Amino acid sequence: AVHLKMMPEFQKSSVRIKNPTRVEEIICGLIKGGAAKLQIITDFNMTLSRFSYNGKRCPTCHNIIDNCKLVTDECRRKLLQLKEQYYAIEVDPVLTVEEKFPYMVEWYTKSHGLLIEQGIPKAKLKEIVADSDVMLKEGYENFFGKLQQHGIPVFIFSAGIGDVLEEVIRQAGVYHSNVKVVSNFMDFDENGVLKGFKGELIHVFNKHDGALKNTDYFSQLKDNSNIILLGDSQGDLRMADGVANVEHILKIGYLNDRVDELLEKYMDSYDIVLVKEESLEVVNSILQKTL
Ligand SMILES: O=c1ccn([C@@H]2O[C@H](COP(=O)(O)O)[C@@H](O)[C@H]2O)c(=O)[nH]1
Ligand SMILES: [Mg+2]
Ligand code: NA
């Protein structure tokens, strides 16, 4: 039997669980199924990466570009002001997902617009990432390492910038063959200069869409009917909507901001809520018991 009270990682003060007996049953199911049944579906920004470190906010994939040498100070100022305006709406506890939706579309339209104006060169992405302040969560090496050791499919489903996310994980040495990335990927002109983005926009509140547009992937993983889903947003709860067969699914949510206002809604919607938590210790502990 799984007993959360016997697991110290689950007693940390950042760990909030509305229904601990259900979480026990789920984890029991994951352990029963083992490697052969497991797959991971995860957000990227503020889920695999840190929201803050030493009381300083850490960059998202977009911010990595916002803050880099290839963007003028005037442009950075505009982008920073856009983030102040639109992040405030993103996390606003009063607004419904449906009311936030159009503002997210608008943010990305404005943000990508400006990045295209700045003409970001493909050849500079390696340096841009290496020079940035991006930080993955504590325990990332063991998370990706254990998953690759056991050939567990990992689907990273991000509303950020795919090229940047890939370069982050490549540089951290964790972009193993079991990792599939779906995000907004840059489109480059003949000179290697940013001219637009590929495919349909993925934003905070339409991941339910892209979840259904990856059937090649999920239909090949029909046997992988036990899922661990990691997210930081209410939008992330939809990322497993394309999964072929779900037997047991555990949803772990990082709650990074507006904690008191959002705690109830997060505890109702995610099985395990990790409040202001910069490590992957809880998911790593589950994987240790499962694999
Ligand atoms: O111009 C933008 C657009 C989005 N985001 C952030 O990107 C995150 C989406 O990436 P992910 O969390 O889905 O990986 C959103 O939470 C949003 O705050 C930015 O920082 N700048
Ligand atoms: Mg996120
Ligand atoms: Na590299």
CSV table of all heavy atoms in Angstrom, one decimal, residues 43-49 60 90 157-159 204 207 230-233 236 256, ligand 2:
chain,number,residue,atom,x,y,z
A,43,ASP,N,4.0,20.6,-18.9
A,43,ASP,CA,4.2,22.0,-19.3
A,43,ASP,C,5.7,22.3,-19.2
A,43,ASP,O,6.5,21.5,-18.6
A,43,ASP,CB,3.5,22.9,-18.3
A,43,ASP,CG,3.7,24.4,-18.6
A,43,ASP,OD1,3.4,24.7,-19.8
A,43,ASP,OD2,4.0,25.2,-17.7
A,44,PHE,N,6.1,23.4,-19.8
A,44,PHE,CA,7.5,23.8,-19.6
A,44,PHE,C,7.7,25.0,-18.6
A,44,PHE,O,8.2,24.8,-17.5
A,44,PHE,CB,8.2,24.1,-20.9
A,44,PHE,CG,9.7,24.3,-20.7
A,44,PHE,CD1,10.6,23.2,-20.5
A,44,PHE,CD2,10.2,25.6,-20.7
A,44,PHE,CE1,11.9,23.4,-20.3
A,44,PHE,CE2,11.6,25.8,-20.5
A,44,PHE,CZ,12.5,24.7,-20.3
A,45,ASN,N,7.4,26.2,-19.1
A,45,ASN,CA,7.8,27.4,-18.3
A,45,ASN,C,7.1,27.4,-16.9
A,45,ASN,O,5.8,27.3,-16.8
A,45,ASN,CB,7.3,28.6,-19.1
A,45,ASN,CG,8.2,28.9,-20.3
A,45,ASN,OD1,9.4,29.1,-20.2
A,45,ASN,ND2,7.6,28.9,-21.5
A,46,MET,N,7.9,27.6,-15.9
A,46,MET,CA,7.4,27.7,-14.5
A,46,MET,C,7.0,26.3,-14.0
A,46,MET,O,6.5,26.2,-12.8
A,46,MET,CB,6.4,28.7,-14.3
A,46,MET,CG,6.6,30.0,-15.1
A,46,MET,SD,8.0,31.0,-14.7
A,46,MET,CE,9.3,30.4,-15.7
A,47,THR,N,7.0,25.3,-14.8
A,47,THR,CA,6.7,23.9,-14.4
A,47,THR,C,8.0,23.1,-14.3
A,47,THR,O,8.4,22.6,-13.3
A,47,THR,CB,5.7,23.2,-15.3
A,47,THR,OG1,4.5,23.9,-15.2
A,47,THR,CG2,5.5,21.7,-14.9
A,48,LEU,N,8.7,22.9,-15.5
A,48,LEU,CA,10.1,22.3,-15.5
A,48,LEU,C,11.1,23.4,-15.1
A,48,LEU,O,12.2,23.0,-14.6
A,48,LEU,CB,10.4,21.6,-16.8
A,48,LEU,CG,9.4,20.5,-17.1
A,48,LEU,CD1,9.7,20.0,-18.5
A,48,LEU,CD2,9.7,19.4,-16.1
A,49,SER,N,10.8,24.6,-15.5
A,49,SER,CA,11.8,25.7,-15.1
A,49,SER,C,11.3,26.4,-13.8
A,49,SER,O,10.2,26.3,-13.4
A,49,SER,CB,12.0,26.7,-16.3
A,49,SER,OG,10.8,27.4,-16.5
A,60,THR,N,10.9,33.2,-18.6
A,60,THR,CA,10.3,32.2,-19.4
A,60,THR,C,11.1,32.2,-20.7
A,60,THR,O,12.0,33.0,-20.9
A,60,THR,CB,8.9,32.7,-19.8
A,60,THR,OG1,9.0,33.9,-20.6
A,60,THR,CG2,8.0,32.9,-18.6
A,90,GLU,N,-3.3,37.2,-17.2
A,90,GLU,CA,-3.1,35.7,-17.1
A,90,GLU,C,-3.3,35.1,-15.7
A,90,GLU,O,-4.0,34.1,-15.7
A,90,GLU,CB,-1.6,35.4,-17.6
A,90,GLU,CG,-1.4,33.9,-17.6
A,90,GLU,CD,0.0,33.5,-18.0
A,90,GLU,OE1,0.9,34.4,-18.3
A,90,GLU,OE2,0.3,32.3,-17.9
A,157,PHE,N,4.7,20.1,-23.6
A,157,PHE,CA,3.6,20.8,-24.4
A,157,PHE,C,3.6,22.2,-23.8
A,157,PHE,O,3.1,22.5,-22.7
A,157,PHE,CB,2.3,20.1,-24.1
A,157,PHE,CG,1.1,20.6,-25.0
A,157,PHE,CD1,1.3,21.6,-26.0
A,157,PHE,CD2,-0.2,20.1,-24.9
A,157,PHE,CE1,0.2,22.1,-26.8
A,157,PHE,CE2,-1.2,20.5,-25.7
A,157,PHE,CZ,-1.0,21.5,-26.6
A,158,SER,N,4.3,23.1,-24.6
A,158,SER,CA,4.6,24.5,-24.1
A,158,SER,C,3.9,25.6,-24.9
A,158,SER,O,4.0,25.5,-26.1
A,158,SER,CB,6.1,24.7,-24.0
A,158,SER,OG,6.4,26.1,-23.7
A,159,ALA,N,3.4,26.6,-24.3
A,159,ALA,CA,2.9,27.8,-25.1
A,159,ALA,C,4.0,28.8,-25.2
A,159,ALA,O,3.7,30.0,-25.3
A,159,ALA,CB,1.6,28.3,-24.4
A,204,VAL,N,-1.6,30.2,-23.6
A,204,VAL,CA,-2.0,29.7,-22.3
A,204,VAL,C,-3.3,28.9,-22.2
A,204,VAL,O,-3.4,27.9,-21.5
A,204,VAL,CB,-2.0,30.8,-21.2
A,204,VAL,CG1,-2.4,30.3,-19.8
A,204,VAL,CG2,-0.7,31.5,-21.2
A,207,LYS,N,-4.6,24.9,-25.0
A,207,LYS,CA,-3.8,23.7,-25.1
A,207,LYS,C,-4.7,22.5,-25.4
A,207,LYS,O,-4.3,21.5,-26.0
A,207,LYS,CB,-2.9,23.4,-23.9
A,207,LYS,CG,-1.7,24.4,-23.9
A,207,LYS,CD,-0.7,23.9,-22.8
A,207,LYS,CE,0.4,24.9,-22.7
A,207,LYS,NZ,1.4,24.6,-21.5
A,230,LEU,N,2.1,17.4,-15.4
A,230,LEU,CA,2.7,18.5,-14.6
A,230,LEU,C,2.3,19.8,-15.3
A,230,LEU,O,2.5,20.0,-16.5
A,230,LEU,CB,4.2,18.4,-14.4
A,230,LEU,CG,4.6,17.1,-13.7
A,230,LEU,CD1,5.1,16.1,-14.8
A,230,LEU,CD2,5.6,17.4,-12.6
A,231,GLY,N,1.8,20.7,-14.5
A,231,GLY,CA,1.5,22.1,-15.0
A,231,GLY,C,1.7,23.2,-14.0
A,231,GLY,O,1.9,22.9,-12.8
A,232,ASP,N,1.5,24.4,-14.4
A,232,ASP,CA,1.5,25.5,-13.4
A,232,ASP,C,0.2,26.4,-13.6
A,232,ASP,O,-0.1,27.3,-12.8
A,232,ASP,CB,2.8,26.4,-13.5
A,232,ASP,CG,2.9,27.2,-14.8
A,232,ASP,OD1,3.3,26.6,-15.8
A,232,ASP,OD2,2.6,28.4,-14.7
A,233,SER,N,-0.5,26.1,-14.7
A,233,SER,CA,-1.6,27.0,-15.1
A,233,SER,C,-2.9,26.1,-15.1
A,233,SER,O,-2.9,24.9,-15.3
A,233,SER,CB,-1.4,27.5,-16.5
A,233,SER,OG,-2.5,28.2,-17.0
A,236,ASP,N,-3.1,24.2,-18.2
A,236,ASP,CA,-2.4,23.0,-18.4
A,236,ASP,C,-3.1,21.7,-18.1
A,236,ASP,O,-2.7,20.6,-18.5
A,236,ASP,CB,-1.1,23.0,-17.6
A,236,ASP,CG,-0.1,24.1,-18.0
A,236,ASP,OD1,-0.1,24.5,-19.2
A,236,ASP,OD2,0.6,24.7,-17.2
A,256,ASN,N,2.4,29.2,-8.3
A,256,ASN,CA,3.6,30.1,-8.1
A,256,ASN,C,3.3,31.5,-7.7
A,256,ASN,O,4.1,32.2,-7.3
A,256,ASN,CB,4.3,30.2,-9.5
A,256,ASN,CG,4.9,28.8,-9.9
A,256,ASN,OD1,5.5,28.1,-9.1
A,256,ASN,ND2,4.8,28.5,-11.2
B,2,MG,MG,3.8,27.1,-17.6
